[PDB]
Amino acid sequence: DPTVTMMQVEEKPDVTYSDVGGCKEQIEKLREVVETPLLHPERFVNLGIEPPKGVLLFGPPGTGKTLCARAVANRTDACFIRVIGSELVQKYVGEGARMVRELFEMARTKKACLIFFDEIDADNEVQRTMLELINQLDGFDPRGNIKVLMATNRPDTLDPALMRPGRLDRKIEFSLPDLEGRTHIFKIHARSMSVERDIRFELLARLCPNSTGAEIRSVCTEAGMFAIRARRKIATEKDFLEAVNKVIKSYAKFS
């Protein structure tokens, strides 16, 4: 069993829905396709032709690796199978077909398990993987109703100009940073090491305007590295405030 097989199975429920903020319309448009079709299968079959297939998530990174985490946490306790994009473009090409067929075979073993491809943004060696990848995802052999969603940073548009008008639709954006949306990501970062609740979350959220999810992730990451660096017991902004304004301003200069 290769490492991709043992790591491909997703466990340890990550970030949950509590980060609902800012781009609420599109996160609902992509939530009602991963949650509702599997939770309510009878009124979607009796409702008409077929339930929604999926959406597309391109554009700016913003709060990436948090919305797919939300889709993993909000699962119905039947964990699905996700695929990273780094496994597609690797040395010794040709095994991509055996991989994309063995994960569909594992989906058959897991009663039509959902398949997700993360970071698709990673020349016949690529043409066989994208043309055969369309011949497998858009093909009715494994299943045509499990899951189709490409959450990534770059679309890498090779043939979407004519392969977009079909089973895939709902061209939308990923997310966008707002002033009042970051307090929810801080509220889910409260689930980390015990932080003194006397420090208001809005006080820390209003001093970093136009901060994407990755920038505040670097706030609660570099603040943790410089917090364990300070050799203290509890985390208080009066100590790593230089790490906060330094990590939002020194990174806000170029990003």
Place this chain on the structure above:
Amino acid sequence: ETYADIGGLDNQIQEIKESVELPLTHPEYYEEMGIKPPKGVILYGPPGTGKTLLAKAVANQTSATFLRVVGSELIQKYLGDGPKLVRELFRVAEEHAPSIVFIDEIDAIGTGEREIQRTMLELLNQLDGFDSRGDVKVIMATNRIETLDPALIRPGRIDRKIEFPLPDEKTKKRIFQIHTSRMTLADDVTLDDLIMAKDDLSGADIKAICTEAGLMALRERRMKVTNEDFKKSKENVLYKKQEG
């Protein structure tokens, strides 16, 4: 040659000291935080040569298992076996968990050639912790911070990065002070022309002329450092790297 022997950058060496001596050591301020960013710091230096970088990585040699994978030389001098050697070093590092993986003189892209990209991408995949956790730390060091591609940055540096200032004869003053802390020699030896003799040099060839200065000075059966034999032996190093 310890972490406290060199001067002028005590903050930059207590940053890597307090940074890579955090896991597996001093646990009263390590397990309460619960962060564990298993990525390690990344060093660099315009002089490089492994003397200053080795002087920074020597902090781990105090109390730890000795293990240093210096550069990808063994990757390119051997047949195209690929990342399996890195897998053997990572499994012996798994069986040797109380260690710190140090890499010096990264010459992968600075110097077949198409395999360096795939073994570097797979090196990035295995270094990021695809099937591992916070067992061992990884410290990367090279001659230029710009040699690392942007691929090796976001999943290759999440812990901390540092900046090495120009030598300004203070790292050379402290290195020469260490090389003269054991030998016996008066102040008759001019420092500036020898630390800046060719163009600039911190510790490598001054350690070389200290070795051939102890040996060449031992040829005269006198422990004193003659004012003409030291520069007379320096003419060999100055002439060697300039003739060819």
Place this chain on the structure above:
Amino acid sequence: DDIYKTHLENNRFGGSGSQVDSARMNLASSFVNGFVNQDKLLTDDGNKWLYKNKDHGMLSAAASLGMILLWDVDGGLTQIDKYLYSSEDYIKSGALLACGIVNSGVRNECDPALALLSDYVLHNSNTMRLGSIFGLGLAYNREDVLTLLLPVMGDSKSSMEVAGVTALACGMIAVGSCNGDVTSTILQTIMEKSETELKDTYARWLPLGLGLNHLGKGEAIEAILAALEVVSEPFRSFANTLVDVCAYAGSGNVLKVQQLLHICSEHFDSKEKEEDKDKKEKKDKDKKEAPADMGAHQGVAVLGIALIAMGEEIGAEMALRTFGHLLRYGEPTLRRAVPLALALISVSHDADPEVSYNSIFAARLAAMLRQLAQYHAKKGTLTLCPYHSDRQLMSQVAVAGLLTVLVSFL
């Protein structure tokens, strides 16, 4: 000085005192408890902890309150008095053993235990003779106890630990004598030793006290006299080679090294263990020559000879290098013998070999002894006798009552 400058955590009593079960890890918890003397929470954690234990566990746990209280001579009486003259024989016998362990100069608890002494078959004062003669032997050529020990050796009870703590008691009493003695003490225990050639464990632990009385170097003639009279069938010849073990504390006697190499190939599989085990005592100072090629042999206990030959020193990288190979073995004798020297030789690199034990194991002796190493991690005869007597642990669990009262552990 110990309470002020040191501050020990309670997670060892809670954890190491929480994963104990099977009535044997609980014995390891009575070991951790007994060898703790700051904090006295696990010492007084409720009751019934001694009642749930076994008989020999009632001896070790009854002596635990004595091992935790080698201080405060004023309160020792009002602390051990609770278990004295109780309803259980092992509680009061281990309570007199506790009174013998708490102090070594009070000598006021002798009369209520040593006074009667009249059992002659089985009665309680035989186990009280274990705890009182052993504890008094630790407290101590005084005849005021040897004259009473003459009917003790003359009784020859079926219980091995009677002549065990009696021979070791008079032996530790007789160490340091002027050129030793060949009096009716060792003559009496030799005549009564050869009187009945049964239960060879007597012929194993009696040479312990004999060799203890053989101290007094300076070319004494006790080795020649024992070489003349003792030479018999290989049991008393094993006693003779034990006299050869205790008779070579150390000098310039390279004849013992060429004789060591000559006799090292003997068919007898025990004089190699003891006689080859003497290497850790003969050359105990020049540790540069102590590492040898004993690991490359094929004997069934030579890896144990070198493993015990490691000892209790500072534990350099060569010692831990030997424990890296000696740690991985299939027989429970070597896997049970390796954690004792592994944790005694090292008092973020101490608990890592214990994690290696967790990787090897995950039986009962390996778990109890690996917890014994979990707490053991953190020329005087008193530091040379207990383990040399402990070299016979490969027997019944009856010795485990004497396993926890080793005085060489500081």
